[PDB]
Design an enzyme around this catalytic site. Structure first.
Site, PDB file in Angstrom:
ATOM      1  N   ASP A  56      32.458  22.590 -28.909  1.00  0.00           N
ATOM      2  CA  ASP A  56      32.995  23.119 -30.151  1.00  0.00           C
ATOM      3  C   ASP A  56      32.017  23.819 -31.098  1.00  0.00           C
ATOM      4  OD1 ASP A  56      34.559  22.387 -33.454  1.00  0.00           O
ATOM      5  OD2 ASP A  56      35.428  23.904 -32.005  1.00  0.00           O
ATOM      6  N   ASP A 238      34.654  30.761 -32.137  1.00  0.00           N
ATOM      7  CA  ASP A 238      34.896  29.408 -31.776  1.00  0.00           C
ATOM      8  C   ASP A 238      35.069  29.441 -30.397  1.00  0.00           C
ATOM      9  OD1 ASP A 238      36.627  26.934 -31.607  1.00  0.00           O
ATOM     10  OD2 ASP A 238      35.597  26.947 -33.598  1.00  0.00           O
TER      11      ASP A 238
END
Ligand SMILES: *[C@@H]1O[C@H](CO)[C@@H](O)[C@H](O)[C@H]1NC(C)=O
Length: 329
Positions: A56, A238
């Site tokens: 992430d 992201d």
């Protein structure tokens, strides 16, 4: 170099397969892990204890579930658990840490151990978790999260795993790239970009925020007529999210050209994003709405739907994000 990501049924898909209606529910926590469909494996300790974790870029912390979580929080106990007593290289810290996953909090305590990713071992401080909230981790297959962000947006200024890999000087370049497959799996590459999974030439955009993976977008055109973000919208690329996000007011204008107006027609207009003067377009293929307050607000998010078409190099030396047309073989 190569870390192979694996395909995963998201918590959304787990809930939607059962059949369900609409239900209820420090640095800025960008991603909801409800929709996440991808994970990689890492080893912690000597000998290595394996953990399935999300790669992430939204966060900068590495956390996994501990063996020390209580009976009151049942979401922790399901996953693979870290035992310090089976590691000779464990070194205790003991300090409290708290990430705000959503409304609820992910609480634990810090600890240091040898963390192995893609063949490289590094000494890393991580938060072994003792309280995971019920939503959405109980249904989730992944054990924890591996933060690929910057040291500033970490909790307690704890240096990320990639920062320690840069300190060793093992990689050819101070970069990592991501590839999501069209269909089973994905790929995170360290120290370069894989020519098998891209086509043409890269073009880069400089980072706008001080310490994040955020770039200023200069146009969101539907078809051949422009709508939003001419003066400038901030955008985070992201890795841990699948959907594309936008501001709540901005999402309405884009949807025009609970409710989603999707009907079976393939002749809907193509939607593109202007990143550093170059048009990055998506044919069909969904969206969401996240309204964050300033600072770091209002902001967009480019998840796996964008990254599927465009292989993304994350450059730490030059502070920039590169994009190139994806492919398989
Ligand atoms: C825990 O590690 C951090 C480094 O990220 C350090 O600042 C802190 O002093 C350590 N705490 C203890 C109690 O050793």
């Amino acid at each position: 170099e190569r870390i192979p990501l694996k395909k995963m049924p998201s918590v959304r898909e787990i809930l939607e397969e059962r059949g369900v209606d609409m239900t209820r529910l420090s640095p800025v926590v960008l991603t909801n892990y409800l929709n996440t469909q991808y994970y990689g494996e890492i080893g912690i300790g000597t000998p290595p204890q394996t953990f399935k974790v999300i790669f992430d870029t939204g966060s900068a912390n590495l956390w996994v579930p501990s063996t020390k979580c209580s009976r009151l929080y049942l979401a922790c106990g399901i996953h693979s658990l870290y035992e310090s007593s089976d590691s000779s290289s464990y070194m205790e810290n003991g300090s409290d840490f708290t990430i705000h996953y959503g409304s609820g909090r992910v609480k634990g305590f810090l600890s240091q151990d040898s963390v192995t990713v893609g063949g490289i071992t590094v000494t890393q401080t991580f938060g072994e978790v003792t309280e995971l909230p019920l939503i959405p981790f109980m249904l989730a297959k992944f054990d924890g999260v591996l933060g690929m962000g910057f040291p500033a947006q970490a909790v307690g200024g704890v240096t990320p795993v990639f920062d320690h890999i840069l300190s060793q000087g093992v990689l050819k370049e101070e970069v990592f790239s991501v590839y999501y497959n069209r269909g089973l799996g994905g790929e995170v590459v360290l120290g370069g970009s894989d020519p098998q999974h891209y086509q043409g030439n890269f073009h880069y955009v400089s980072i706008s925020k001080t310490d994040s993976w955020q770039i200023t977008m200069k146009g969101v055109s539907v078809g051949s007529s422009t709508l939003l973000c001419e003066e400038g919208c901030a955008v985070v690329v992201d890795t841990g999210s699948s959907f594309i996000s936008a501001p709540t007011s901005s999402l309405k204008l884009i949807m025009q050209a609970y409710v989603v107006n999707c009907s079976q027609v393939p002749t809907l207009p193509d939607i593109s994003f202007d990143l550093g003067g170059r048009a990055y377009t998506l044919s069909s293929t969904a969206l969401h709405a996240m309204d964050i307050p300033p600072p770091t607000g209002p902001v967009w998010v480019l998840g796996a739907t964008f990254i599927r078409k465009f292989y993304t190099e994350f450059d730490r030396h030059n502070n920039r994000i590169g994009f190139a047309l994806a492919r398989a073989a």
